[PDB]
């Protein structure tokens, strides 16, 4: 049918030309809970509503502070590579964090002591490249599509330095002097950046490993998130990766969350920092509790970025038949949450009762174990 | 079918879960012109992607700097009233400008000399309420749905002062003293705001006109935009309303633009200030030329807000079968544009030729008359 | 007695060491109306709580953004001169506005065309010196104590340029060259500023008038506020001085307000800009209505600066036996207010009734004439 | 008598209506040392000059950047609870630090691992609640009045999240799903926040301790400041509590200072960060030395907040007959000071003499041991 | 010889490697007047110390806020064109003001009503192009070198929109539709900007004038500054051009100043706004008096930009044998100054004497006529 912003005796039919397909995706925005109140900033933006930069060998589109202004500390890139295609050797002002959603890829990175790291990354794997360290991505046989997160919301063209772009704007005589070659031996250098470019598939990973006088890097730059044992509860799983287990990831803590049909990520908040969200599949709604009687509900599905400012109360409820899969991202050295249930469960029962105007029949259902995802009884 | 971000040999199929209905609405974002280049801020946001505040008698949803951060100087409200329903007497820090898209309404406003203005507004009419002057809107027999524009992008709950809210937070003894009544005579005052509320239809407009010791207001607060003679050209019309014809509208200049199927709003820019857009019906694309090799194309349809920062080059092309109807809004005392065609038409032909690397065959097609909307030959 | 923050069954006795004399001055702050709600910035500061700069011949103390941070656009100086004492010839980045509260003084000012203005100012007179134009103040036989207002809240030592300070930090050879004199003829120039200094009383004003080749100034720099006919109403008078009557005062509009015992400055707001207040004598309370259910009541007496941010609702009620005398100051070319009474009086009565949930018995007491000050019936 | 701003031959009698009781409290502001010079921001504000929020069971008033703009990093709340009364379970964006000035209270706090801490706090005890961790305060038999300090000067209503407010703006169906209950079992939930509310006295502390599967917290959230051995010197004591002894207090370092009649907190500065002051009882003056010939003297008594910007020179002298008791507060993991005496005492004597233009008769009185508080010889 | 920073018994020889040629150009910076005191921002920058952008047909180098951070409101370009060479048709966010120092040029500009202006400009002529209006410059037979001033200090690549750059980043199909041509008829359009490009000399100015349906522009865009009668005084001339005589120049007021050897621009200040300076030839020193005992002397010669913040006291003294020629630039609709001499000359003589501690022998030399430039008696 045709949705209308009516809730009981409130609201009215839309009477001007309108976007029906969007209203359908936003049932809880066109028809908000009656508990929503006050000005709350937009916490929702679709990658689908951004310009897609297409190159020979793939593409990349971004969600930044310029699209989603609440997220000042974090931005993201959706990047795709065809098989063998290269994200040209480069470096960033920001640290880079990544989730491999589709395919596989080979990454290189050399650190500030000349030590190198070359590894293959598959679906559910992460990498984290500390700011300023140069790296690359090349897709294997299947290609690769992955989500990148940068720890500055301002990420732009000015955040990225490209190998060939550097050389293109360096005097030919300097380059020649820097390397001990003639200017002729380097006249074939590219005139502009490459960015993404087609290439033959690499060979085996062991034939690529470069030996060096400086040692192996002390900590790997990749992590196998789905090979960990997840916090498994009633209606889903949660895999955490922060600087306590994925050592190099000092500025990005993360959790992959799976919410079964009829389940929810429980009511909680984060006592450490802002949450940045990516919705990989499924459909959700979330209400952000913004303090002082302010609360706003947003709708989410695949391709959406979401956001919860520091310490605001929230939940994320699956409102579809598929499983709901999303990322929670935090610019911090650690994951942390406080569970509404567990909090209240560890207080004297009559104290909780005096607060809530409810009886023993409520407090008996509180649990002292944190269940991040719960199935509807 | 199923769109893919491919243009010739560039781009690739999307491989992760995605928003197909959005990709379909954004053909030129998923598959951008090859002429687009560089970082350009988001200039596009749908009212459909905002929380709708539903009340008994209507609703109101907003697009502000918190949704669309490029637009710092201007925000907007989509407001709907059921028949007889009242937008409670109130005032703003911002000036308010409005387009009646559907229905009709009665407005009141009293100015700083105690003079009052009560008028009815119909489809295609505007009003403009200078900052701080109190006003109201009540819908007539058909109801009313209209677009409001406020001349600060920061518009929020803190921009609006409500009659009953004031009285609710004023000591009862003060109110009584202020009016010369007992506290009992006013115990029935509402405890909270009304905002929007159901009410009986007003009677005739002449029975509402209040006579006063202070005179009629020197300039009306409403304007009949569609009763003007429009600049009519090949593929559409343009009705302008700025402070030169709609006198009270010192901070908002505006034009209603109609672009027939197969036509476009020509390549132009605005030498005075930023453009803010509302897409009433139809489907468009626009490329914003951002200087220094930066350009980004956006897609638009009914319910979308658009934006062109000061002096950036643009056009707006109808890409559908319906007519394209949009508003151009400027926070200024005047409308102004420079036409790429007319500009070049008023320069020596060989000068233009030396610039463009083209011949007499091009310059012969330039016109010295400004045609804001052109049909594709 | 000893005040306590108790209102009915709310609040409690203070139990820690406390400032009793302050609590006594703040009855409505220690015990706020029950209608006050939410965070509202401090709108109250006493000159008594500022460092007094004492010089031979007088003193000067200031209230600025650094004391009262809400007032970003306006600051003030309380300045005192003993008889004959001079506020050393100087100039400011800010425009200067002044109320002579006590005594009399002679002012000089020379404008950008070399034209001079020398006049005497008495109690209730004003002056306004446009930014950057040099001026002086010298107290007559009685001395002089007056309030200065500068149209930047940031006013500081860096706002003021002093005649002798300039010459003290200009090379002696330059000064000599500038004037056509020897360095010896100027060795007696002061080594530091004077700021305020003792001096003999001037003679008659006519013997001081300097004739020049450039004409009289087109508009006087002083104004006799109390010689105007005031808007006189039931419980007080109001004398306005803005750029419409006091021509040179382009950036400062002002009103002297007198509220008799048992009267109030009515419920109103200002649709143009922020209000800055100085309480000359008497005792007041005011509630600032800050929108969205925010309101805070402040207490005022002689020596206090007050403030009402743009468009916020307020009233000012005399809560003492003496008359209440205060200044309302606006950084604008004009005074403007909207009266709650007059506003509602110029709307259809049943409309007002539908808003307020009250009957004909209320609307009959509304008046279409603006009475800025009302006596309690 | 009646104070006047006269110092020798400087200054003059006040001639306009004035605040005598304030002038009396500010002897060194109305009549500043002759050594004071230049623009120095206000470093003084009384809680008495703030709006007191009264609730059933107590009250709370605040001093923030909006009252005292120099203190951007720190704000404070004066909070009072009647016996048994509860500061409703809540959490903050800021870390919270507290001094129990009067009475006693029970606090709860649950940390990010589900571990709980319930303890009683008495006069001279502190607590520190890290940002985002939920907590409560309930007053015991005597009630409780205490000073809270938050490590952001911007503290406002938007800093606090309340248990019942969250639930009031969360969809009833979500809450029910989150807990595994029917909507009926929770229809009695409060509709608005509680904030502070009357309640029966708790029982014994041991009967409240909640056991849990997660362990005891690794570090207590309270500290017995007055049970420490203080740095005792001639004219007073100083008890320090920073993150080196009160482990959890990472963002707040503090010292309780006692200055006997005729003594002073010596001339010193802080090489680490800004100082924030609360004057619990007694009367002081302090001169802040602001560099480059800038210095301003302020007066303090019970209820005043004071402030010394990073590294500025100061002393705090008791100017009354009672003992002077104040708090020094630093947003840092450690307390640190540099003593003018000890500094000079550890330099070669002739070096110090060459600097000060004084002899062996001065340097002989320097001491190498830091005496924070000295009695006037 | 070899300069040293010694003044009497102050300073010392430089002992580290140093820039001798710079020290020689800065006698009053290496050896400042003894009257200079305190922190004053840099007010001096040489175009010689900026990167020169060289193109086929000329060059252009800039001084902006990024070079000279005090000048936030104004920036400048030094631009050179070889004979016949074109500054490609373009437009700016900023208004543009220009002084033709060498050669001659033809300018075009079309305004917002389609009206065109084509004129030739010679040495000492100005033009002013209002923001956003498109224009061009082409050098005549002699070439042309001129100073451009833009009324935003932030001027950068993002301030300029270029004709060919626009078309290069506009879809070919849009351009074709916009003009009514095939895509083939426009395949020769340039792929990148031109910026500056070689070209044949134009013919006569009358053969270039384009007639149009819209009328002549109401006010010319050029001005013959040196054909005016200058304010001629003892040691030099001053030609003013502001919006009172050069009508279109609403945002830029200007004066060309000539100071003979042994003369100076007198001690004065500007009561309206900041001064921006360009030193065309000669050598100067200036002391900026910054208030509150702050003053700093700077040295200037050909190619230097100088700056005096609003209302600061200054003079500009020729310290060389050639005449000194500089521009004074103000972002305002009018030129205005206050003369130290004339100011004091229009005050009662004994008043001036009481201020300065000097006698009739001084005041007798004051003049009531403003002489902007004075020769050393
Ligand atoms: Mn990267
Ligand atoms: Mn979360
Ligand atoms: Mn409105
Ligand atoms: Mn446009
Ligand atoms: Mn002054
Ligand atoms: Mn007012
Ligand atoms: Mn708390
Ligand atoms: Mn200290
Ligand atoms: Mn230009
Ligand atoms: Mn000047």
Name the token pair of E335.
């030129």
Q: In Å, how far are A148, D208, D216 from D117, measured between CA atoms?
A: 40, 10, 8
Taking an 8 Å cut-off on Cβ atoms, the answer to whether C101 and D156 are in contact is: no
Q: Do D295 and D331 contact (CB within 8 A), yes or no?
A: no
- Residue C190 CA from chain centroid, whole number: 33
User: Element (H or E) spanning A327, and its range?
Assistant: strand A324-330
Q: Do A195 and A85 contact (CB within 8 A), yes or no?
A: no
D269 Cα to the center of ligand 8, angstroms: 6
Q: Do E276 and E156 contact (CB within 8 A), yes or no?
A: no
For tokens 């706003």, the residue is A296
CATH superfamily of D51-224: Jelly Rolls (2.60.120.10)
Phi–psi pair at C344, nearest 5 degrees:
-65, -30
Report resolution (Å) to 1 decimal.
Answer: 2.8
Round the CA-based radius of gyration of chain E to a whole number and report it. Answer: 24
Dihedral sign (CA C288, C294, C297, C298): negative
Distance CA D365, CA D368 (A): 10
Residue C338 C-beta-side C-alpha neighbours within 13 Å: 29
Distance CA C194, CA C182 (A): 24
Angstroms from B57 CA to nearest CA on chain C: 14
Residue B291 C-beta-side C-alpha neighbours within 13 Å: 19
Q: Decide if B328 is catalytic.
A: yes
Taking an 8 Å cut-off on Cβ atoms, the answer to whether C166 and E264 are in contact is: no
Among A311, A348, A356, select the one facing D93 at the smallest CB separation.
Answer: A311
A107 Cα to the center of ligand 1, angstroms: 10
B7: chain A residues, CB-CB within 8 Å: 54
Residues 6+ apart with CB under 8 A from B62: B50, B75, B76, B77, B78, B155
Q: Do C104 and C71 contact (CB within 8 A), yes or no?
A: no
- Give chain A's end-to-end CA distance (angstroms, integer): 30
C347: chain B residues, CB-CB within 8 Å: 89, 108, 110, 116, 136, 210
Strands C116-122, C160-162: pairing kind: unpaired
Name the token pair of A246.
């994925």
- Minimum-distance ligand to the CA of D92? 7
Q: Name residue B278's beta-bridge partners.
A: B305, B327
Distance CA C93, CA C133 (A): 9
- Secondary structure of E56-99 in HEC code, one letter for each residue: CCEEEEEECCCCCCCCCCCEEEEEEECCCCEEEEEEECCCEEEE
- Indicate the SS3 state at residue B59: strand
Q: In Å, how far are B134, C41, C272, C343, C356 from C269, measured between CA atoms?
A: 10, 18, 9, 11, 19
Name the token pair of E123.
């040495």
B167: chain C residues, CB-CB within 8 Å: 356
D276 Cα to the center of ligand 8, angstroms: 9
Q: What DSSP line would sit under B228-296, residue for residue? A: SPPEE-SSEEEEEE-TTTSTT-SS-EEEEEEE-TTEEEEEEE-SSS-EEEEEEESEEEEEEEEETTEEE
Distance CA E325, CA E284 (A): 9
Q: Do domains A1-50+225-377 and A51-224 have the same CATH topology?
A: yes
User: Element (H or E) spanning D166, and its range?
Assistant: helix D163-168
Q: Name residue C55's beta-bridge partners.
A: C58
Instruction: Give me the torsion for CA of C369, C373, C375, C377, rounded to 10°.
Output: 40
B295: chain A residues, CB-CB within 8 Å: none
Burial (CB < 10 A; 0-12, 13-18, 19+), residue A122, is: middle
Q: In Å, how far are B39, B259, B270 from B313, measured between CA atoms?
A: 15, 18, 8
- Indicate the SS3 state at residue C141: strand
In this structure, the number of other CB atoms found within 10 A of the CB of residue B233 comes to 17
In this structure, the number of other CB atoms found within 10 A of the CB of residue C195 comes to 19
Distance CA C68, CA C46 (A): 10
Taking an 8 Å cut-off on Cβ atoms, the answer to whether C186 and E310 are in contact is: no
- Indicate the SS3 state at residue C179: helix
For tokens 């409308």, the residue is B335
Instruction: Give me the torsion for CA of D262, D265, D268, D274, rounded to 10°.
Output: -140
> What helix, strand, coil percent values describe chain C, rounded to 5?
15, 40, 45
Round the CA-based radius of gyration of chain D to a whole number and report it. Answer: 24
Residue of E nearest to B271 (CA): E132
Among D15, D52, D56, select the one facing C9 at the smallest CB separation.
Answer: D56
Reference D96, options D114, D66, D75, D82; nearest CA is D75
Taking an 8 Å cut-off on Cβ atoms, the answer to whether C70 and D66 are in contact is: yes
Distance CA D302, CA C16 (A): 9
C371 Cα to the center of ligand 6, angstroms: 13
For tokens 């593929």, the residue is B235
The chains in contact with chain E, meaning 3 or more Cβ pairs closer than 8 Å, are B, C
Name the token pair of E152.
């935003």
Round the CA-based radius of gyration of chain B to a whole number and report it. Answer: 24
Angstroms from C21 CA to nearest CA on chain B: 25
Distance CA E377, CA B73 (A): 57
Residues 6+ apart with CB under 8 A from D50: C29, C42, D61, D62, D63, D67
Name the token pair of A1.
């049918």
Distance CA A237, CA A231 (A): 6
In the PDB record, what is the listed experimental method?
X-ray
Dihedral sign (CA A293, B305, E134, E215): negative
Reference C242, options C265, C215, C270; nearest CA is C270
Reference B39, options E172, A69, A50; nearest CA is A50
Q: Checking phi first, is residue D180 left (phi over 0); if not, alpha (psi -120 to 50) or beta? A: left
E311: chain C residues, CB-CB within 8 Å: 91-93, 131-132, 161
Distance CA D146, CA D128 (A): 13
Which of A356, A369, A373 to mutate to test binding with chain D, by most D CBs within 10 Å of its CB? A356
Name the token pair of A20.
């029906």
The chains in contact with chain A, meaning 3 or more Cβ pairs closer than 8 Å, are B, D
- Burial letters for D180-212: b for 16+ Cβ neighbours within 10 Å, e otherwise? ebeeeebeebbeebbbbbbbeebeeeeebebeb
The residue annotated as part of the active site, out of B72, B184, B328, B369, is: B328
Chains A and B touch, contact meaning at least 3 pairs of CB atoms under 8 angstroms apart = yes
Chains C and B touch, contact meaning at least 3 pairs of CB atoms under 8 angstroms apart = yes
C5: chain D residues, CB-CB within 8 Å: 52, 54, 59
Which of B93, B155, B177, B191 to mutate to test binding with chain C, by most C CBs within 10 Å of its CB? B177
For tokens 């992760």, the residue is B16
A150 Cα to the center of ligand 2, angstroms: 19
Distance CA C260, CA C281 (A): 12
Taking an 8 Å cut-off on Cβ atoms, the answer to whether A294 and D169 are in contact is: yes
Distance CA E158, CA B372 (A): 26
Distance CA A72, CA B209 (A): 51
- Minimum-distance ligand to the CA of C86? 5
Looking at residue D205, what DSSP letter applies?
Answer: H
- Give chain B's end-to-end CA distance (angstroms, integer): 30
CA angle C167, C168, C169 (to 5 degrees): 90
- Residue C29 CA from chain centroid, whole number: 23
Q: What DSSP line would sit under D164-190, residue for residue? A: HHHHHTS-HHHHHHHHT--SGGGTTS-
Taking an 8 Å cut-off on Cβ atoms, the answer to whether E37 and C190 are in contact is: no
Q: Do A282 and A302 contact (CB within 8 A), yes or no?
A: yes
Among D161, D170, D188, select the one facing A291 at the smallest CB separation.
Answer: D161
Residue ranges per structural domain of chain D: 1-50+225-377, 51-224
Q: In Å, how far are A246, A255, A338, D141, D309 from A335, measured between CA atoms?
A: 12, 8, 11, 40, 35
Does B37 carry a binding-site annotation?
no
Dihedral sign (CA B98, B99, B102, B103): positive
Taking an 8 Å cut-off on Cβ atoms, the answer to whether B22 and A51 are in contact is: no
CATH value of A1-50+225-377 in 3.40.50.620, 2.30.110.10, 2.30.30.830, 2.60.120.10: 2.60.120.10
Strands D75-81, D58-63: pairing kind: antiparallel
B6 Cα to the center of ligand 4, angstroms: 30
C44: chain D residues, CB-CB within 8 Å: 49
Among A266, A354, A368, select the one facing D199 at the smallest CB separation.
Answer: A354
Q: Do D271 and D339 contact (CB within 8 A), yes or no?
A: no
Distance CA B283, CA B304 (A): 10
Strands B263-269, B314-318: pairing kind: antiparallel
User: Element (H or E) spanning D51, and its range?
Assistant: none
**DSSP-H helix ranges across chain B:** 20-25, 27-30, 163-168, 172-179, 205-208, 340-345, 349-356, 360-363
Q: In Å, how far are A186, B203, C347 from B209, measured between CA atoms?
A: 85, 11, 8
């Amino acid at each position: 049918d045709i949705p209308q912003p009516i809730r009981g005796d409130k609201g009215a039919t839309v009477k001007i030309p309108r976007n029906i397909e969007r209203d359908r995706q936003n049932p809880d925005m066109l028809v908000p809970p009656e508990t929503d109140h006050g000005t709350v900033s937009n916490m929702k933006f679709s990658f689908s509503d951004t310009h897609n930069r297409l190159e020979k060998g793939g593409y990349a589109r971004e969600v930044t502070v310029r699209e989603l202004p609440i997220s000042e500390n974090l931005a993201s890139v959706n990047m795709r590579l065809k098989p063998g295609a290269i994200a040209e050797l480069h470096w960033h002002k920001e640290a880079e964090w990544a989730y491999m959603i589709y395919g596989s890829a080979r990454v290189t990175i050399v650190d500030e002591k000349g030590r190198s790291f070359i590894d293959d990354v598959g679906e559910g794997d992460l990498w984290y490249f500390p700011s300023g360290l140069p790296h690359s991505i090349q897709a294997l046989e299947e290609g690769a599509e992955f989500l990148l997160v940068f720890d500055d919301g301002s990420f732009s063209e000015n955040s990225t330095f490209q190998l060939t772009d550097w050389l293109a704007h360096t005097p030919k005589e300097v380059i020649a002097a820097n390397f001990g070659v003639t200017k002729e031996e380097i006249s074939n250098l590219p005139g502009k950046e490459k960015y993404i470019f087609e290439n033959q598939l690499p060979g085996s990973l062991k034939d690529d490993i470069v030996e060096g006088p400086n040692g192996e890097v002390p900590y790997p730059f990749t992590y196998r998130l789905l090979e960990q044992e997840p916090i498994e509860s009633e209606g889903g799983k949660v895999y955490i990766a922060d600087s306590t287990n994925f050592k190099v990831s000092k500025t990005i803590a993360s959790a992959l969350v799976t919410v079964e049909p009829g389940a929810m990520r429980e009511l909680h908040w984060h006592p450490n920092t802002h949450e940045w969200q990516y919705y990989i599949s499924g459909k959700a709604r979330m209400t952000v509790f913004a303090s002082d009687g302010h609360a706003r509900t947003f709708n989410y599905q695949a391709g959406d970025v979401g956001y919860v400012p520091f310490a605001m109360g929230h939940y994320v409820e699956n409102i579809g038949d598929e499983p709901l899969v999303f990322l929670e991202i935090f610019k911090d050295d650690h994951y942390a949450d406080v569970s509404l249930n567990q909090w209240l469960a560890m207080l004297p029962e009559t104290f909780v009762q005096a607060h809530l105007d409810l009886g023993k029949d409520f407090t008996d259902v509180l649990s002292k174990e944190k269940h991040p995802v719960v199935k509807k009884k």
